[model samples]
Target: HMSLTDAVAHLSPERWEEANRLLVRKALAEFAHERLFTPEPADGQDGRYVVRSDDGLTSYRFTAVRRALDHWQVDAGSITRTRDGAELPLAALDFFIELRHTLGLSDEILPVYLEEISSTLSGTCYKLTKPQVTAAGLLEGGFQALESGMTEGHPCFVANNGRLGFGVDEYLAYAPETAHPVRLVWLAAHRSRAAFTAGAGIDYASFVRQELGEETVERFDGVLRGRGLDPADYLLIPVHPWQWWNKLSVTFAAEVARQNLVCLGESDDEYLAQQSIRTFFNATHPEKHYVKTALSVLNMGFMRGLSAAYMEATPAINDWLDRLIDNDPVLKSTGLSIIRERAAVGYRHLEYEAATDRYSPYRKMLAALWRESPVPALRDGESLTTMAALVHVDHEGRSVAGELIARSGLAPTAWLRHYLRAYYTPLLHSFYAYDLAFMPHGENTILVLKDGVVQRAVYKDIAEEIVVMDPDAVLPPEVRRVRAEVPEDMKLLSIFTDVFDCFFRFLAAGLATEEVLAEDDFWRTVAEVTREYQEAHPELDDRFRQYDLFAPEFALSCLNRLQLRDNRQMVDLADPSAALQLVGTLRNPLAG
Candidate 1:
């Protein structure tokens, strides 16, 4: 076993300083973009700005170039904190404490927010220990290597890495950045409370056998039979080890005592955690489906738990989406498709299900889903990377997208057009034609790359995130849950905020910063592709005019603002539009 000292060895004085400075820089930039507070010009210093705490006794000064979409490209070295004419070291916790009022962090949430900040800082320090990989070098490492090598968590959120429940030791063992192999803890829940559902052509017995080979399944059954339990009356579920040891054992002890849930030991297949902490990619069997389990950790905006109730319809929703993509000529031509969530198993604790409201964490604590892996879909000479990797700026300030452009043997605009056509056009068509929207963040989409060029896009994490904005939209009974009653005006925000503002804003800024593509050229290419999509589909003319992708401006849906208001469960899933924290307007770059 490694010493405890080595566990925290990454937290050197130098690394802490660097981590704090970097995080504080992100806080300033994102907060400014969200219009949490405006940065005033520093006296006579061009491109230099200052922001003071609410009390005005402390102030932070930094050099930043304000770019399109109000992006603050802040220089980390140029940032400084001062109070009473004495310069102070950049500390993220202190930064938050000083500006808590301005950020509207309530008394109940401030301490929790600070804890999250500490965790985020600690994560950065841990990442600092990894050997610096250039953008090109990251691409050379292939898909998972590049995934684990990513330093930045979410480009827009400052406290993106706050896995509040993880201890430092647990973080190393389980966090994606650590690149540790994990074996899932298996459990057999009695058929009375456990449910297993799968998509078309998949059955419980065969799918379980396929996942856990007959040998292991028999062994697990032997253990149950040995305990005077009938294996025929149970459904098997794969769980995160941390969940079993830290949560299920304690919270669901009654179920175990009653013989409703029994531990069946670990499975042989080893898996790697994806960017989303609860999901795992099968390392031992890459062709096998991905396993997503429930973890009751508060990260980003919600308890990272899967809902058992939601699991019932998961497979059907994915199947419907896959068929929809296949039937649509526009989506099919873009090579756009989803890796279906094929099967799911969920164990319901009758007590928790009844005692709590629909939103309680207790009801969501024990569930798992199987999603198809994109590995088997790859053709010769083609590789894959998380779409988030596109904005990954290396230690030397080079972006993975820029490196991809350099290696693609295509001009910057050509490369950009190809990418937009593959990724963006599908989103547009889905919205105009179907009133469908996806949470198409970097983590949710996979970019299929062939010789450094984006060939197509594969979307994952369905059932939970994909939404049909039209409440009256025709859907199969099992797929009706995807229909959300989003207001007419707010429907388009799904694309404008999610794709244009959140993802493209960073992509554009990074490419411009690296001199790969000019800002004007970047937006012009987007505009060109968008117009091309609209012109090609005369049937979508009225829908295009209604949504108005070329509108001069759109609502600035501030993400950090949502987290600041309520870090836990930032948006109510039942009525997501009600919780949006829109501040002002952002100029639509596509309008150009």
Candidate 2:
């Protein structure tokens, strides 16, 4: 019930400057790590570094503590910009514009990249508006609290919160940082062009009834019948209200007019959007499934849309993964489980489907998947938190991981060991034993915690991201979609790049900065946990030798480089590795 003016009151000049400063800090750090450009030691300024524009006239100087995995922990306050010896404000957009040449941002991509940077900074400003809470306070509030309280997005990506298509109002209404309760718009798509698939034991009618109370279902059916359409011929799908308004109501006008898709009004349940913008957590009924809808916004890299054809295999893929984890004693012992995407309903626009190739955003306009909520699975006195929180730093430069370590009352390495064992072990087993890899970055994984100690790891966002690198591995026909033909040499980059560099680098640096754990001990603990897992599975010795986690260096696969090169659809999903920017190599922190 706030005015538009009030909604954006967070964007004061003071906050804007801080936001810009922080983003520039991240840009300098991550860009330097990626070797987009190298920063030289400032002459006569010991412990300080400088990076200049391509012309070398403009320069930025900052003090940074370089840590393990080539992590540049830049001091935000220490960063200063200068042009011709005159001081300049640390403006993020201008920083990009100034260094566009060195960053390799092409003419076509620079402006869009600037918009993304603006959006990202605006998001940070919005977060600053919230009454700052410490990690301990967040822990007390429980799962949704931690999820919405996160200040940082993907640690490695500079323009992490672009959300290009969202207007300022939409950003306030739908962004996870706003933490607003949203009601999903319901749609009835005629079954001829829509497909509904579910995991074992999930029936459409029963699931729909469970999701929407029977009364609501009756109301919806009545609406369809009143419109002269048979309810039985249509399948119900939840749509993001923004998508319905912005994309579907207009873009799919033909289907609506032809009675192929009918608007059935909003559902009763109020939900909170998770960090992943399209996914909603049921606030009214925590035990209910998370509804993930297709959003056509251009964010981070790709058009944030779900594919109908790919979604048809969601349930089957999740089923296969669930059974695999359950059947494997090692994975089970490590308490690794996946909150399966139980059911999916996709509405195919036949015209769009035929007009464009499978990768087109047009065909991905209307699809929804229901993922299992982590709530009902929680045991007594256990709370849920996104794994991303481990690296989350607060206003006072405190990290959630450090807070958890302090609260655990255990030695730092002990708590870290428990976490590494719970989280990293399953990833190792999955990779070595099955050649399976997941997009196991922070947001995709959830941690089960008891009294600030991590008890288990639950993985989600399964159907689209999990890949079986070994194409020849035995697999069922329904689950065969996950098979990918990855080169043997780069296969283990799944661990070195995704888990170690992408996740652990930030975590290790944050904890080190907080003085909770030293960088050496942090990496050592990881090494020990890895060795422990390795010794436990001596049968996989040949595979262990094939992929050496302790190698001196690994390919430096740069994420920002990909986005800078092509901000839209950075990677071809069909051939992901081919799009990688492997500039050089990174000295492995685990190397002895």
Candidate 3:
């Protein structure tokens, strides 16, 4: 059982006649390498080698043939140089001599090397080394062996580049141990070409220069045409014409070279010609219409995503925005601010029914405010209370009210002003004050009156209560009582709740019914109020937009308002327990 390693170790130049049988030895070596490196079969098999029907024997045969070819080529070149005047290039001759010596072949085995080289040159058959396996480790091993045997006392020869000498150790150290076989093939092909050029009396430098320049431009044209972009676009931009030209030029050349090497049946000349045509066409067209088209196509999804977000937020629309956001997480997270704000406004409309009905214009104004805010802080994932506070107090109530003495808008501010004028006036004169007293009470109800008129009332037990009373009567008494109890306090909570109830009624009439706040008329009023507010507080407009009212402070202010609104509803509804439950639910759930 002579293993391939043993056979190779014993092989000598004298065994020229036995070289054909060496194929068996090389095949076994290749098989061993494959078994060691490649993935093992999932099925358990015997340790000893057994030829299987599925084995790639043909590939193994090719490997063996290629190894034989390589050995013969190098060894024959060495023998020829030794026998002759070393007519080959110095590098080539040195490489060959080193290879033969590395194989441990003496003069007795010289004929075997000569025979192999002769066989290769005749081209009776040629086999290529499998690049992944043979290019690095095996090639370096062979070279190392050759160098060890070539010089007396193993004296290293420095490879000279005509002007500088690179030491043998340095040269070999820097050389990549594993490289693509194509790189070696390219080097060999160049050497062959050089040899041919010398023999043909061609000026190598001139030929190479001409070939490089012509091929590069031709390739550039080819790549431009392939991409469907006009190369002339770069040329037209004179400030950096070379930038464009160089980009196309380098790309074209590289692609042409790649095609020549990778594409079977493509000669260097044919590849160069094809590249030239492509480059010319690209240059002629110059406009990057194809690039623009590609950009537009790629951006279509982004455009669609934005549109979908907008559509989802639009009023009177119901769509699965969650699914849309799921598809694009960034949009879901970053781009949903506007949609979220709008959704919050919608939710607010549902929460404050009466307030919306009375102040119908404010609902439209609030919607506008939400849209502008875009990223408002939401309460309970639905309420735009923070934004509402900003619009009502900072923008409208404080700024506009301070200047106009009352709220004014497209619809007559006269009615709102009339209520405002009598807001703190005596109960008989005040709409809200009078309405709070002498309002009708439901069953199981108790009324609290002052001056023989109902001032405050409560129903004993009802699931949900609705009050159908004038806003003036409902709000004024509570405002008067709170002001009377704490005269120093502004009774802002009471005033805001009254406003909320009024607005709710306005919204209900305009939207739910056709009675209280007329939808078209409300929006028209809001536009007028907004314009007047902006004109009155030009300096405050920009300042308010950037203002950051801290959350705790804002929540406290809203809580006071909530209490006032809830108290009225509680008394009017005559179910204090139910009102307490509702207030408990609306307050911060984390306040346990």
Candidate 4:
């Protein structure tokens, strides 16, 4: 039948209808909550609401249980689309097109934005076709299982799974959802253009040999030598298969033709792609550092490309953060750690560099970084799971958080406090003590779990995410790029929005839904942990008030708003704080 090569095979009239409804359900609820367009209560139905499309000819009707922090718990099965008194199928691309004006999409960005929406819908359809598993069942499985099994993407964003650049064949072969094992294509990049940087005491040859194994390294080197070139004069770069097939071989075909970029064939070992599209976790050696590559796909809000220029300081940035985390007594005591990017290699395509600015995706392609894997760091019984998995409620309403709480044999509140102390305490200390902030969102933070209890937290995706928010804070010359000037009042937002609202709100609500813990109790535990940590550090009292957590409310920064405005370049790296879409305020759930 149509089982092979049909992304739409799973997207039957039935499944497509449901997936589109669910995604639009999220859109209506989130867009309304983000204040882009206010959804009004439908006459005679309390929770049922009406979201009129930009043109009055189209409209959406859905029922949602409005939750705290403007989180709309949308009932996907309840959504319906209507136009001119006729009910219609739930079409994701059509939904966005109808609401284009309401979403503030420019004419230039609308078509590309719709393409992302369609790709997201296709991913959802593929996810729906998977066999069902409960959270308890997922716990019995491995770490990579839980990572790839995440059905819901980001809780807040409607187009969270937009791997747009991927065609169906490539998507099936490599998307993280597939959980397929494949080897990366290794390329020998000429030293005249490619630069490789490593941490202290790690040389080019030893690290590459260790990563590839001597036999494979020699094979790769032999390929370079056979081409009448000295292997020593080149730097080896690992690339995603999609990049090798879709980009490097196509966009930079001239380099291949001139023999500047030589493919040494695929790796001898298998690796599983992680949730982050470009990063792969080693299945062959388990302990091998995760190799993050530059695929140049359009995902989330921007082209998912690793900037060649931004790669220069990546190893140093990770090293600098590694030292800072180790030196802080309070941060260290919480057992919070980071999986540092140990080495990075970037290839410069002089043609692309000359054609575009640094922000351009052309300049951002063809780079790779190897981050220390949390797998090797695991102690006797510890295993790692992404913090995003905590929010995952399975096919039959099972929750990972609930399963862990049950397995831990701790009362719901007790387990919450345990998690809060290990998770939020470090965030509090980092912000108030050192003015250092990280994008500690669900995906970026990995929980080190021992028997279903969180032993510690390991933050990853450094260089790109962590920011030193203080304008006056001193930073080493090698890592100065991490420093960002922000308005003092908005500094606490790095914690409040990034951690509290963006992550905890959905988690707190998810736990409450599963009857694992009350939402109020969860936030209270978080507030208590914050209070306890602050009291221990009396020196930070002045800074505490300066960035008060107990304030009446904080800015309700709209994440989707930024995407709606400029999906291509949502936030400027040169000045990220300038891109915030602080619509209004969210009442602090932790407030007294």
Candidate 5:
């Protein structure tokens, strides 16, 4: 028997202390690296620095081993917090509040930002409670296990798991950390107000039947007809149980009361919440499509809601990408594929849409989309795992990359090439050939493996992230919204910022810190991949020169800076290119 308290029971005094110290270490290290604050060397103390709080009444001292690309290998245990020569327990919320001025966290965003930090600290404690699994063991545990066990949610973002809307009880039921099974709630929405979009050969009735099965379809439709509502007039939507009880019933109460939306109960198959919070994977029925529902919750600097207007273009954008992938020889040769967002349904709240701007969360309250599952694409003797698990050092002090190397019986460098060939080459080709770039960060891409070797890469969450940097690039009018006018110098950051610094910087540091692979060799391997890909396509020489992978320096686009500037409005999706938080430049590791 479990209690509500079970969610945070691991947050004992000792673990809380340790988690807080880790967070403080991260704060000091990252903030200093961001040039938010200058850490002074403390009286000839080797590798030790001190940062005073905003009021100058408090001081934090920590030891950090420096790494390439400005990573601070902070010693979490070597951190101390003191005020007026008196000790204080390391508090994540207090730490941020103390350094607020330097970090530039505004009064409006600070309190809410503190709330996110608190949740982040609690999440760390919850993760510590799990049984430690070695990277080797996890490499063999299949994809979902690895996905759920990832310790660091996002390497760069300090308060990454700040799932603000969840109460203690809801977090246990819903958070990916809990690894709990979830069944989705079903709703029949009136077609008069709700719009449904699907791919070329898909229709409402057959697609719903394919996903829910005919018997369950009948049951759901029966619930609609029982209320004297014709089944034909309504569109079936899969919703997050949290959204149903917390958001839809309250935020969209008019939809429920006016009979524009009718509840049809829950689905039988269990699903699991993915790392992104809103997306769900079919755990019980693996072959079925993944369902993504909007939640009116705040997390990671965004309102964690799906836009209704965006839903109309999603399926069309996905099909267009799929067609491009199928036709391109270079992309096909890399074995790159995407799980298309097959269909989408949205309920337009007219009042909210009228009152707020396009970026407003009110207009984002209610939407759901369905995407194809990667399970059916897996050949026999093959396995699948998120690219994230590869970068992280697992709970048992082992690196997944190291384990994959050993499991493949390849040298570390040789094994890394296999991974880059499958993952990196595709992203490079997409950019140079078609002016296309994806959110190639770890969580968004999946690695298909066989006998511990990466066979190919599959990208997901298609419609929301893939960017087209060419403002003049021809595209079907339906997908033209993806065309963002980025500066010529900043466009290469699709690889530089996201894949290299955001992902590889951590993977390299973690491996080197663990003595798995030398840090220099890590960057060297990456440079080799870059040069090798460029050499293959000499025909696109001008394109390669325009977006030089070997540029001596590139704009240091800041992730935390974006969040700190306006955590509530870190990005404007409608005009993604117009709002960049690029501060300065970092020397490209590949160049010099």
Candidate 6:
């Protein structure tokens, strides 16, 4: 009487030798018992029997005993017979027993029997239960199930039942206990037919039917029958418990552990272990089912890679810069002219607001423009001053100036001063708007030559108008013509004096408080001009609003204040010593 541990211990190294000896002795005893007492039927008899003498001859028994011992020790192999008495190996018999016990042979047997019945009839048979008849029919049913469930696109026909169909769930439910051998028939016949007939060599359907049928039949008759059993009796089922447990169990356990670690904090190793044990039947139980699903999940990584590549290439900014320039007349003329000129000359200098310091409201605009078009730095032998001088040249002479500047090492201001000496007067005259008749001294800075003494400097576009007394107003012919040509719709002559008055009123409003400006008669004229402008073109409001510059003065004042504050802060924070140190380090890092 062996204890459970003792029984298991026989498989271990220390006791294995003795255990093998005992097994041999027990096998010998059983063999002797079968040969000596079991009877064989007399020669020529219909039924088989094993005969023994009543007074058994002890002399011949010794020979039998020796033979039995040899059989057990050397050939401890057995033969089994089915109901029809066909001999089968003891190993195969054991397999059959396990199959029947694990899968409940009766249930599966019924389907196989039905399949055999169908095989016997050329069209269809009603029923069959014999193992010898069901082989081909069972194969046909398996093939049909595989074919019907397959989608038309993919070439392979997958099984729609068993482990493949019910997936891991069914495998866990049914194939847990037995070591049942599983055979996979990949239907290479169909693939072979497809290949052979692809370019008009053979008809695929007929070729497959003949080739596969003949091969399958030969296999069934030769290999299967040689095993001493009908092919119908051979059913493929999953075997090798560790195959599933190692592949599936390891995968599932790893995934579960990963998820547990992710959900719980990193420090919760003990909790993860405990949870794994609880969920997976002590963490050592077999888990064949989960391994299959993990393989399927890993296949999606390729698609994820493609999606990531697409996301990386898309653009980020979408607003239009042209729309901003079209709205404000000042911005349209001065701002756009600066940008276009800079672009034309390929100037890489940073843009700053017209203020005391570099940091100002124009920072965002400059940053946006740079982001759109980053200029490359000047190469060796290039001079910044020379480049500025070249930009100031006439269009046709620019290339020549650029070449000359490239050769010269002079400072930019020196080149600019030389260039301007030739072109300054014309340039200054051009700076004056033909309509406004006011000259800008520096960029947008207005120069007012009042009584030959320059006083207040206003932005060129910001000044409302220039007033010349009737006697002193030496208006250009173009201006007088434009005033005369003003259409009936504009009623220009009737409103010319009023327009002038209104312009002066705006200037006064800028110089004084709004309350004081409103009391003057000029306010009424200004109001009438505004109303007339609107009445003449009602769509102007929407158009100007789109540019975001309908309230020009207010917007400019706000921008000015912001720029002033920013410049002040920058100046306050600026450290000339730190800047000099940085520059010195850049020049020569080892410098003391």
Each candidate's clash count: 0, 0, 48, 0, 0, 9
Using all chains and alpha carbons, the TM-scores for the candidates as numbered come to 0.99, 0.99, 0.14, 0.97, 0.97, 0.14
Judge candidate 3 against the unseen true structure and give its global Cα lDDT, from 0 to 1: 0.22
Worst 10 residues of 4 by lDDT: 1-10
* Tens-digit lDDT string for candidate 1 (407-465): 88899999999999999999999889988899999999999999889999999888999
What global local distance difference test value does model 5 have? Answer: 0.85
Poorest lDDT segment (10 consecutive residues) of candidate 3: 291-300
Q: Note the residue pairs that clash in candidate 4.
A: none
How far residue 549's Cα lies from its native spot in candidate 5, in Å, is 1.4
lDDT per residue, candidate 6, 1-592, as tens digits?
3554432332343333332332322322332322323333334433332222233221111112121101211222221223223433222122222333222235434343222212112110011111222222222333212111111110010000112212233232222111112221211111111112111132434433332355554543454345444533322111122223433235324322422101111110111010000010111111111011011110100100011111111111011112322554533432221111010001011212233244322221100000111112223322112111111222122222333323344443333233332223222222122112222222222222112122222222111122211223345432222121222222221122121211221222221222222223333333343443345445455532332211212100011111112211212212311111010000110011
Q: What is residue 585's positional error in candidate 4, in angstroms?
A: 1.2
Off by over 4 Å in 3: 1-491, 502-512, 515-592
Candidate closer to the true structure by lDDT (higher is better), 4 or 5: 5
lDDT of 3 by residue, 1-592 (tens): 3454432332343333233223223223322222211222223332222222122221111111111101110111111112132232222222323433322335554343333333322111111111222212222333222111111110001110110111222212111121101100011111111121111122434433343346544555455556554433311100011111322224224422533111111112211000000111011221211000000000100110011112123321111222333464323322232121112111122223345553232222111101112112322322111111111112111321111221223223333323222221211111221121111111122222122122222222111111313222333221222111211121222222223222322222222122223434433443343344335445444432432111111111221122222211212223222322111111211112
Score candidate 1 by TM-score against the native. 0.99
User: 75, model 5: CA deviation in Å?
Assistant: 1.2
lDDT of 4 at 11: 62
Candidate 2: residue pairs that collide: none
Off by over 4 Å in 4: 1-8, 57-59
Residue 121 CA displacement from its true place in model 6, Å:
99
lDDT of 4 by residue, 262-337 (tens): 9989998799988888899999888888999997887788788898777789888888887888898887888988
What is the lDDT for 172 in model 3?
25
Model 6 residue 79 lDDT score: 18
